[PDB]
Symmetry: none
Subunit: 32 residues, 6 copies
Amino acid sequence: LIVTQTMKGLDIQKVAGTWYSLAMAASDISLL
Amino acid sequence: LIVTQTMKGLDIQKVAGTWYSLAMAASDISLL
Amino acid sequence: LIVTQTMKGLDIQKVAGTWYSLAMAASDISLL
Amino acid sequence: LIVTQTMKGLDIQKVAGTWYSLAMAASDISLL
Amino acid sequence: LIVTQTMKGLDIQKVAGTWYSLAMAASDISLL
Amino acid sequence: LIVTQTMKGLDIQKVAGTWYSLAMAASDISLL
């Protein structure tokens, strides 16, 4: 398993809330 | 398992809330 | 397990709240 | 002549160019 | 002549260029 | 001539360029 996540040139504003993650990677992921 | 997360040129403003993580990586991840 | 998280050129302002982590990595991660 | 210009809650981003004025008021105005 | 210009809660980012004025008021104004 | 310019709660970032004025007021103004 190979994960390559690249982000370039991002503009985030007024994102009031519960922002968990911009980029996420794992072997196993579960949201309840 | 290989994880490569790169971020370049980011502008975050007025993100009032509960920002957990910009970049996240793990073997196992669970959100309840 | 290899984790490589790089961040370059970041501008964060007015992020009043409960900012936990910009970059996170672990073997196991759970949020309740 | 009465001018009342109010602005509340504004979000301006990536406005690269020649932004002259957000709010303008005058007796006389000419653009060549 | 009365001019009342109020601004509240403004978020300006990445406005690279030749930003002249946010709020402008005059008796006479000409742009060549 | 009365001019009342008020600004409250401003967030300006990454405004690289030739920012002339945030708030401007005059009797006469000309741009060549």
